[PDB]
Amino acid sequence: SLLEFGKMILEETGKLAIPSYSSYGCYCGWGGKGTPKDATDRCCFVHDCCYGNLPDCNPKSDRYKYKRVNGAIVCEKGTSCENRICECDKAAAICFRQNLNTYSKKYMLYPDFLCKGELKC
Numbered sequence: 001s002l003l004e005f006g007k008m009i010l011e012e013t014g015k016l017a018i019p020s021y022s023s024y025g026c027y028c029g030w031g032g033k034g035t036p037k038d039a040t041d042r043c044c045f046v047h048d049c050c051y052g053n054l055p056d057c058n059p060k061s062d063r064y065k066y067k068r069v070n071g072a073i074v075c076e077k078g079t080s081c082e083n084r085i086c087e088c089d090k091a092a093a094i095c096f097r098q099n100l101n102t103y104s105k106k107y108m109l110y111p112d113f114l115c116k117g118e119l120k121c
């Protein structure tokens with residue numbers, strides 16, 4: 001759920017999901033359309049696509065458990081949906097950590113109309 005995901009984000013990046021990643025670019029927070037604005041926005045695009053592969057699951061509210069072995073995020077086994085949502089989130093968190101050096105504040109509260117172009121998953 002958005003509860004575990006936000007906790008991963010904070011531990012990885014040191015930033016708070018809201019509002020650091022809830023209104024960033026074209027895909028972080030609104031789901032959305034357009035061409036990802038940067039690496040971090042690409043993390044969100046892929047994350048959205050990951051959730052998109054789980055039609056019969058509920059990522060926002062289904063809670064899962066995860067632990068950290070040597071700092072590494074480890075998804076604990078739960079239901080099938082829980083295992084897969086965790087992996088989707090785990091990947092986004094790492095992706096965010098990997099692109100921290102490039103995170104830009106000019107993309108916060110990005111206006112919707114500036115999100116143009118297309119990109120399928």
Ligand SMILES: O=c1ccc2ccccc2o1
Nearest residue numbers: 002018022029030031060
């Ligand atoms: O798209 C979202 C995702 C999570 C969330 C949590 C609190 C308030 C607003 C939110 O919007």
